Design a binder for these strands. Structure first.
Lengths: 71, 71
DNA sequence: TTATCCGCGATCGCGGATAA
DNA sequence: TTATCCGCGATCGCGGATAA
């Protein structure tokens, strides 16, 4: 897990985790009660995605996050 | 830096960093080109804040973030 | 200093869908 | 399977502000 500085880097990181684990967008969406469409718009167009969507998808990916220094 | 699971925990964590360093919302807003109002709505009502706003404020706080396991 | 207001255009996530 | 569509109500971040 590298340091992440932008919505695009975040979405790329989380899509990679989804794919590495062989999960579909629909599977994740169902587990957390949002639309598959919403996961798709996040992976491809994350700039205006809400923090709520972000934290729900984190949960579905079995992830959390932490702050750290920009170094 | 603890693991964070929700927009509310994230906003509380970042407000604390802002305050511990003695920064005003206006100072941060100016450094990154957003409204002070936007920083205020994030600290108090983060659920629908955009990822963009989040990453810009991170920069102004000299922070980055990383993913990690939900444990 | 910060929470809060107006009016605005833009985009969210929603329900409900589809192609191939 | 996923990117993408419609129509919708809600909220974003914007410029520009204010109280105390």
């Amino acid at each position: 897990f590298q340091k992440i500085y932008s919505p695009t880097q975040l979405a790329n990181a989380m899509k990679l985790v989804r794919q590495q684990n062989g999960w579909t967008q629909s599977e994740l969406a169902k587990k957390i009660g949002i639309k598959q469409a919403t996961i798709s718009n996040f992976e491809n167009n994350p700039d205006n995605t809400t923090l709520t969507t972000f934290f729900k998808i984190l949960q579905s990916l079995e992830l959390s996050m932490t702050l750290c220094d920009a170094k």
